[PDB]
Amino acid sequence: GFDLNDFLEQLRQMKNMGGXXXXXXXXXXXXXXXXXXXXXXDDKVLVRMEAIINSMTMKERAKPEIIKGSRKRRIAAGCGMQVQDVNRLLKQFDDMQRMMKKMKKGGXXXXXXXXXXXXXXXXXXX
């Protein structure tokens, strides 16, 4: 299935090649709707991600749903960061579990095409 093992290797294979100026120029439809400068700090944030996924025991990665308050104190202490950042990293991983299970069920073309860019009313940004 999809774990923080494959997420570990996803983000450590993606911390080699990952950049925000090379990947905000490889899509013309998503850099015109949401702002082109909301991309990322790739080295900071992917070395953060790899740090936080190094702070985990291996069945905490292969079974991400058993991570609770004490586990996040221990992870946030391990790499020298805030419990909230580990919260939002397990958030990001949750979204990617959503997306790759959706890519598992739906054929690659019907889950990459039905992908939607979204605003709260037709007026720009609000």
């Binding site: 996803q10 990947x23 490889x26 899509x27 998503x30 990322x40």
Partner: peptide, 18 residues
């Protein structure tokens, strides 16, 4: 390929606007 471009594109990017 196709699953590496569908990996990386919406990974880097859909981690950006969300």
């Amino acid at each position: 390929m196709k699953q590496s471009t569908l990996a990386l594109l919406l990974l880097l990017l859909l981690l950006t606007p969300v």
